[PDB]
Design a protein around this ligand. Structure first.
Ligand SMILES: Nc1cccc2c1CC=NC2=O
Ligand SMILES: [Zn+2]
Length: 207
């Protein structure tokens, strides 16, 4: 049931999605080991992901969360990187997209920094890098991220599939050492995210 609509680079929506991609690149403590060395991306395509069943699954859970949290879904747009982008856009998020070994337990992880999600496109820790050249810093091969609508509801704040902490709908990983890092977020039900944009890109070699 999924269809992908290409956005024009002239479309304000393409432009606002690209700006969130580009403006949330940071340097990483691994010096580029997992995700490569880059300060910016070459955006090749941005597609809107349209699936009625999946959307209605999302908005149903969103209303449940909202009614449990004084009519506040606490909805964010966040990045997700994974080698299973194609399963996600067609069948939705579920337990098979959980990061079992993540620092907040087995849940589905999202990032405010696009460059954080970029580290997971080829696997945990970047895996063995691109399938073609086995390079985690490949500047040639096309990568994909999701920019997703995520319902956080009442989020458990951690300074730093399973269930959410009692009385909470998600976990927030607040950075407490690296002053430049943005937050990461974990949900424990696939229905609390909808994969709204598929972004196809390359990382760009710094000059
Ligand atoms: N662990 C973590 C933190 C933030 C974002 C992501 C992840 C994992 C996979 N994909 C992600 O996009
Ligand atoms: Zn490659």
């Amino acid at each position: 049931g999924t269809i992908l609509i290409d956005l024009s680079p002239d479309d304000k929506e393409f432009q606002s999605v690209e700006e969130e991609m580009q403006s949330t690149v940071r340097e990483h403590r691994d010096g580029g080991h997992a995700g490569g060395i880059f300060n910016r991306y070459n955006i090749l395509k941005i597609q809107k992901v349209c699936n009625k069943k999946l959307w209605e699954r999302y908005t149903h859970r969103r209303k449940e969360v909202s009614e449990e949290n004084h009519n506040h879904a606490n909805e964010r747009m966040l990045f997700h990187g994974s080698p299973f982008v194609n399963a996600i856009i067609h069948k939705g998020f579920d337990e098979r997209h959980a990061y079992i070994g993540g620092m907040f337990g087995a849940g589905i992880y999202f990032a405010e920094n696009s460059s954080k999600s970029n580290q997971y496109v080829y696997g945990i820790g970047g895996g063995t890098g691109c399938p073609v050249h086995k390079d985690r810093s490949c500047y040639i091969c096309h990568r994909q991220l999701l920019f997703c609508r995520v319902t956080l509801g009442k989020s458990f704040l951690q300074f730093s599939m399973a269930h959410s902490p009692p009385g909470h709908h998600s976990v927030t990983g607040r950075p407490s050492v690296n002053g430049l890092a943005l937050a990461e977020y974990v949900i424990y039900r696939g229905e609390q995210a909808y994969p709204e944009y598929l972004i196809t890109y390359q990382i760009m070699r710094p000059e």
